[PDB]
Design a protein around this motif. Sequence first.
Motif, mmCIF file in Angstrom:
data_model
loop_
_atom_site.group_PDB
_atom_site.id
_atom_site.type_symbol
_atom_site.label_atom_id
_atom_site.label_comp_id
_atom_site.label_asym_id
_atom_site.label_seq_id
_atom_site.Cartn_x
_atom_site.Cartn_y
_atom_site.Cartn_z
ATOM 1 N N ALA A 157 19.908 30.204 32.151
ATOM 2 C CA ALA A 157 20.530 28.995 33.501
ATOM 3 C C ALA A 157 22.103 28.920 33.215
ATOM 4 C CB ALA A 157 19.828 28.070 32.981
ATOM 5 N N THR A 158 22.570 28.525 33.923
ATOM 6 C CA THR A 158 24.129 28.260 33.506
ATOM 7 C C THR A 158 24.272 26.585 32.332
ATOM 8 O OG1 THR A 158 24.394 26.743 35.591
ATOM 9 C CG2 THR A 158 24.696 28.902 35.788
ATOM 10 N N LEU B 257 19.905 42.055 44.311
ATOM 11 C CA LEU B 257 20.287 41.265 43.024
ATOM 12 C C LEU B 257 21.111 42.522 42.150
ATOM 13 C CD1 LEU B 257 17.286 39.125 42.633
ATOM 14 C CD2 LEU B 257 19.482 38.325 43.397
ATOM 15 N N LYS B 258 22.414 42.163 41.773
ATOM 16 C CA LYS B 258 23.067 43.193 41.075
ATOM 17 C C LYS B 258 23.818 42.364 40.087
ATOM 18 C CE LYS B 258 23.978 46.706 44.732
ATOM 19 N NZ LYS B 258 22.796 45.691 45.748
ATOM 20 N N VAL C 27 21.670 33.303 41.817
ATOM 21 C CA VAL C 27 20.839 33.507 42.019
ATOM 22 C C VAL C 27 20.446 31.843 42.372
ATOM 23 C CG1 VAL C 27 20.310 35.214 41.567
ATOM 24 C CG2 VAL C 27 19.505 33.392 40.048
ATOM 25 N N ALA C 28 18.987 31.604 42.484
ATOM 26 C CA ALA C 28 18.212 30.664 42.385
ATOM 27 C C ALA C 28 17.031 30.513 41.953
ATOM 28 C CB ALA C 28 18.298 29.534 44.075
ATOM 29 N N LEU C 29 16.348 29.210 41.489
ATOM 30 C CA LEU C 29 14.883 29.695 40.677
ATOM 31 C C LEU C 29 14.286 28.451 40.905
ATOM 32 C CD1 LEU C 29 16.219 30.437 37.289
ATOM 33 C CD2 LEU C 29 14.977 31.893 38.737
ATOM 34 N N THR D 71 10.254 30.769 39.438
ATOM 35 C CA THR D 71 10.687 31.971 39.625
ATOM 36 C C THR D 71 11.688 31.793 41.349
ATOM 37 O OG1 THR D 71 8.612 31.652 41.980
ATOM 38 C CG2 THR D 71 7.903 32.030 39.318
ATOM 39 N N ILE D 72 12.217 33.015 40.921
ATOM 40 C CA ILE D 72 13.377 33.106 41.667
ATOM 41 C C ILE D 72 13.140 33.044 43.324
ATOM 42 C CG2 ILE D 72 15.145 34.875 42.488
ATOM 43 C CD1 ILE D 72 14.093 36.266 40.316
ATOM 44 N N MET D 73 13.548 31.898 44.436
ATOM 45 C CA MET D 73 13.687 31.786 45.087
ATOM 46 C C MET D 73 14.055 31.775 46.196
ATOM 47 S SD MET D 73 10.770 29.594 46.174
ATOM 48 C CE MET D 73 9.436 30.705 44.341
#
Lengths: 55, 54
Positions: free
Chosen positions: B5-6, B24-25, B30-32, B38-40
């Motif tokens: 988390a940022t 995803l690299k 990304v979104a959680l 969980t990744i959305m």
Amino acid sequence: DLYSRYKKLQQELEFLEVQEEYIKDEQKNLKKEFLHAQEEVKRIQSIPLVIGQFL
Amino acid sequence: FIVKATNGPRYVVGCRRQLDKSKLKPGTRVALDMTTLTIMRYLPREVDPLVYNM
């Protein structure tokens, strides 16, 4: 005592015949419940893993 | 997927079903989920709207 010295031998013999049959079946059921125990270790997590570090 | 988390903590979570995990690299935004975390979704990267305002 040639009347019941040799015939009371079967008396406490039938019973461990049956336990000799029995403990087999209890081992036959505890593998099932061992598998249930092991799988129920992993129902709560290890998709949602959070990160700390050891101290 | 090891993520952070940022605003704070770090997690290991997973995607939905069809989120194109290969895309995803490390260095992607990304979104959680809120609750299950969980990744959305993954988005094209941020702007920091000083870019926008000029």
